């Protein structure tokens, strides 16, 4: 019985409208099972609903989890770098037991800090988006938060709302709704009690508005039966494989080198015959070769790169919810800092949507301010203020502020509640006008649509007389007027030539100012001679003027600066708008998106469509590369007009460069030009659940300028991804380098496998952590936007790892070779196998970590900067990095012995390894000098 009602909504036909008259009645012949409250209002008792639905079912429940910890790190533990880093240690431990196992223990404790804090991301990441994902239910004034829905609720329906559970119809207007999500099918299904009354959740409005009870509200329905049952990315895998081939090459070079060397020594050279007993002191020789090998592959192989990225766009991502923007989409954090086009609506985004009265013209009088009512002439004003009150639809009102005296609240449309504040300020009250007729004698209404762009009232008040008030725009109304209401109540005829004299001495300048014109009229019937209200093109007209109002929403205070600063950037904004075009482009110069003096092109979409379209209704791309390259402001626009412009945008190619564009389109028309978006952004407070739930990026305080913001992290996150490339390039190399000299020279390798496992955790795992948590900073946006086939590593970066590792490469040399000379401290040079270790490698070793320690710090600042040490200190985590890398290598040096094949050094060869270390900061400031060119 709950759920085979379900059965009969299952027909989707024909079938299920004749079940309903056959058995079932109407929804009133069941609905007597529950209460439901009809046509009354739930007095909201907090015991209330547990009689009716005594079983208590919602769909808020979610999935357990979509992973667990032990899954997610395994699933982390699936990375190609982390399976040759298992297989290298796995190799090195097998090959040891045959202190030998250290050195596997070191890889583990890489691959151990790559998978637990990828795991960690991964964990958190995904609650949080879990985390962050007033209802439809309607009565007196009951709105509770959205996620209970319950069966019985009165759920009203209006145009653009997404239904959250499935129902029937009882009555309403013209309710189109489109079943694509369900059937396939996009064309707009026209529901009726009589032909389709089915209401599916998960279905989108498109229009008309009505009342819905229930059908069967739970997962048990259709709904449930499912339930139940990146460029930078491929780049930067492309360069870890080349990277991670080279090291192949060169580690193998290096093992061949020593073995074909050592073989050539000991059997050719000196005449040695093979003899058994020294079978197993070879095979060491040989061990010790191998595991060499191994370690230079560690070295080489690019490990924390996909731990940078990881780590960059988690805390890019955690930081950008502190500045007003709710990301969905991960990757749109990175592509929105190669934006280039930012298409926006004017209202709600780049004005604040309070719309006030500035400007009126009454009493055949232009008054730049709210006049005195003693001013206006009598007779006038109480038919402005009636007019006004019985023509704001009695739903909208200026509701008190209560909240430390701000502004007043404002609840309905715009333009009612700022024609209702001139009435105030009038110093007349609508509210007894009101209450006189709560639409007790209203005799017909003309609801307010985009098409008419006006709205007529019917009042029957009078005896036997018949009033229409009928506001409108100002350019339709105000031309079909045939007398005005000027002086003392007088009533004059208006003439064309009159019509169009105080069009440019009156509308013109509001319109300038930024201000939008609507105009005021009413018109009295005889008797009751006919009511011939069928045909609505005979009864507006010969209306009166009464006043015309102009007024303003005020552009935001923050906007004109992230205008400037977006147009600095080299992304250019341009705005799409359904006001006039004298409007639109007096608050575009008020924005600063067309300057005043230039060849910018600002068009109606009327004229739009008819000129990107040639002979014929087919529309063409070739057509449309004229149009676009220049045109600023767009008025009059469509709903579908805007994405007309952003697929003629981003299907473009007659310019060099592609094209990235934005759309902060917020609306329920918007679902598919916020698609072909490659970041679409959706405003917040105003936005409807149908675009927020096709958007990439949410937009919290419904503002222009956190967009700035979100370009300046983006580019950020790239910044990140570089400067982690020049630190690990250039020690891979060095390293690499270094030890195949030692295979060709002293045949020794200088650095051991555990003091290159000890580079490699300080420049691979630590330095991800380190250089990948940089804070951003607003120079960012001040260069032009990267492209899409830039190289990875830019010149500067190549020029940097080049004097740096000629540097280190010198310094390493020169002492590996003359330092016994230089420090007195004896020669290291070709030590036999199992010997203690000596001062004169333990020197290398330190001089190389500090080295590179330096480099840690000097490689921060990809752009050329020559100020290094700029901003250090707002990092908390590079500081602590490295100075534990420099007390525990102190540790190591000191008090680590023959494990890490290290030996106690004086405090004078510790400062000249730390003044070598200098030097590094030292060479890094000459080398800034060279240009790059
Ligand atoms: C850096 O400057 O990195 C060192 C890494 O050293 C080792 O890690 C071990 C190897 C030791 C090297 C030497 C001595 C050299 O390795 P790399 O040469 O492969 O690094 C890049 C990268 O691979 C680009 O993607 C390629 O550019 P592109 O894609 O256009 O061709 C191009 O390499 P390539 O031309 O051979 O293919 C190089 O710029
Ligand atoms: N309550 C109203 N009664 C009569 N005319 C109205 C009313 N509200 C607005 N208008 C006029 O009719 C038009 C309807 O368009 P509307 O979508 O309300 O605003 P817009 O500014 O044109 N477009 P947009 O910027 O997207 O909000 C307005 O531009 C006014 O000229
Ligand atoms: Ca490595
Ligand atoms: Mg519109």
């Not at 979610?62 to 395994?74: I, N, S």
Request: contains cysteine; glycine residues 6%.
């Amino acid at each position: 019985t709950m759920e085979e009602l379900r059965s009969l909504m299952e027909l989707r036909g024909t079938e299920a409208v004749v079940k309903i008259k056959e058995t079932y009645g109407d929804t009133e012949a069941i609905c007597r099972r529950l209460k439901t409250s009809p046509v009354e209002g739930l007095p909201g008792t907090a015991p209330d609903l547990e009689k009716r639905k005594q079983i208590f079912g919602q769909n808020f429940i979610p999935p357990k989890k979509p992973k667990t910890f032990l899954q997610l790190v395994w699933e982390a533990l699936q990375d190609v770098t982390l399976i040759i880093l298992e297989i290298a240690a796995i190799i090195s431990l097998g090959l040891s037991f045959y202190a030998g196992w250290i050195e596997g223990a070191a890889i583990l404790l890489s691959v151990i800090c790559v998978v637990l804090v990828t795991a960690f991301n991964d964990w958190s990441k995904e609650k949080q988006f879990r985390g962050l994902q007033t209802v439809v239910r309607a009565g007196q004034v009951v709105q509770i938060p959205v996620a209970e829905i319950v069966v019985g609720d009165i759920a009203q329906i209006k145009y653009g709302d997404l239904l959250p559970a499935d129902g029937l119809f009882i009555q309403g207007n013209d309710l189109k709704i489109d079943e694509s999500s369900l059937t396939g099918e996009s064309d707009q299904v026209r529901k009726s009690v009589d032909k389709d009354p089915m209401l599916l959740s998960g279905t989108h409005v498109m229009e008309g508005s009505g009342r819905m009870v229930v059908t069967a509200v739970g997962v048990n329905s259709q709904t449930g039966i499912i339930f139940t049952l990146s460029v930078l990315q491929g780049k930067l895998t492309k360069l870890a494989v080349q990277i991670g081939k080279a090291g192949l090459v060169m580690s193998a070079i290096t093992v061949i080198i020593l073995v074909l060397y050592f073989t050539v020594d000991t059997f050719v050279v000196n005449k040695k015959p093979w003899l058994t007993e020294c079978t197993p002191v070879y095979v060491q020789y040989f061990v010790k070769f191998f595991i060499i090998g191994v370690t230079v592959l560690v070295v080489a192989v690019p490990e924390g790169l996909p731990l940078a990225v990881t780590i960059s766009l988690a805390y890019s991502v955690k930081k950008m919810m502190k500045d007003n923007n709710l990301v969905r989409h991960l990757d749109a954090c990175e592509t929105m800092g190669n934006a280039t086009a930012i298409c926006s609506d004017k209202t709600g985004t780049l004005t604040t949507n309070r719309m006030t009265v500035v400007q009126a013209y009454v009493g055949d009088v232009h008054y730049k301010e709210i006049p005195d009512p003693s001013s206006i002439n009598a007779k006038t004003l109480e038919l402005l203020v009636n007019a006004i009150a019985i023509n704001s639809a009695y739903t909208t009102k200026i509701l008190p502020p209560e909240k430390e005296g701000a502004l007043p609240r404002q609840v309905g449309n715009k333009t009612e509640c700022g024609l209702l504040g001139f009435v105030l300020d009038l110093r007349q009250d609508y509210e007894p006008v009101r209450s006189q007729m709560p639409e007790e004698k209203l005799y017909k209404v003309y609801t307010f649509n985009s098409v008419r762009k006006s709205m007529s009232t019917v009042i029957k008040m009078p005896d036997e007389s018949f009033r229409m008030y009928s506001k409108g725009a100002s350019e339709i109304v105000l031309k079909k007027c045939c007398k005005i209401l000027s002086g003392a109540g007088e009533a004059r005829v208006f003439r064309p030539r009159d019509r169009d004299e105080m069009v440019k001495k009156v509308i013109e300048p509001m319109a300038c100012d930024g201000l939008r014109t609507i105009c005021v009229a009413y018109r009295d019937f005889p008797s009751s001679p006919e009511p011939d209200w069928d045909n609505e093109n005979d009864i507006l007209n010969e209306l009166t003027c009464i006043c015309v109002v102009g007024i303003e929403d005020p552009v935001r205070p923050e906007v004109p600066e992230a205008i400037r600063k977006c147009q600095r950037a080299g992304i250019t904004v341009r705005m799409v708008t359904g006001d006039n075009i004298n409007t639109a482009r007096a608050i575009a110069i008020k924005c600063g998106i067309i300057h005043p003096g230039e060849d910018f092109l600002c068009l109606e979409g009327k004229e739009f469509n008819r000129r990107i379209r040639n002979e014929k209704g087919e529309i063409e791309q070739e057509r449309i590369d004229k149009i676009w390259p220049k045109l600023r402001v767009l008025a009059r626009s469509s709903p579908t007009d805007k994405h007309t412009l952003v697929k003629g945008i981003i299907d473009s190619t007659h310019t060099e460069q592609r094209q990235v564009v934005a759309v902060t389109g917020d609306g329920t028309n918007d679902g598919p030009a916020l698609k072909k978006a490659d970041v679409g952004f959706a405003m917040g407070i105003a936005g409807t659940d149908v675009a927020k739930e096709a958007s990439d990026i949410i937009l919290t305080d419904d503002n222009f300028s956190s967009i700035v913001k979100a370009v300046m992290w983006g580019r950020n996150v790239y910044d990140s991804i570089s400067k982690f490339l020049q630190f690990q390039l250039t020690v891979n190399v060095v390293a690499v380098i270094v030890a195949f000299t030692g295979a060709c020279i002293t045949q020794d390798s200088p650095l051991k496998a555990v003091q290159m496992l000890w580079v490699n955790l300080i420049m691979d795992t630590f330095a991800s952590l380190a250089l990948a948590t940089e804070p951003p900073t607003e120079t960012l946006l001040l260069r032009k936007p990267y492209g899409r086939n830039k190289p990875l590593i830019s010149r500067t970066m190549m020029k940097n790892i080049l004097g740096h590792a000629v540097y280190q490469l010198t310094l390493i040399f020169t002492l590996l070779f003359v330092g016994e000379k230089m420090f007195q401290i004896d020669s290291g040079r070709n030590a036999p196998l199992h010997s203690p270790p000596s001062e004169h490698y333990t020197i290398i070793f330190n001089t190389f970590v500090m080295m590179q320690l330096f480099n840690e710090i000097n490689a921060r600042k990809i752009h050329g900067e020559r100020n290094v040490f700029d901003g250090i200190f707002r990092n908390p985590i590079f500081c602590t990095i490295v100075l534990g890398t420099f007390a525990i290598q102190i540790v190591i040096v000191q008090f680590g012995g023959k494990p890490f094949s290290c030996s106690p050094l004086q405090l004078d060869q510790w400062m000249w390894c730390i003044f070598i270390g200098l030097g590094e900061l030292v060479w890094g400031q000459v080398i800034a000098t060279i240009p790059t060119s």
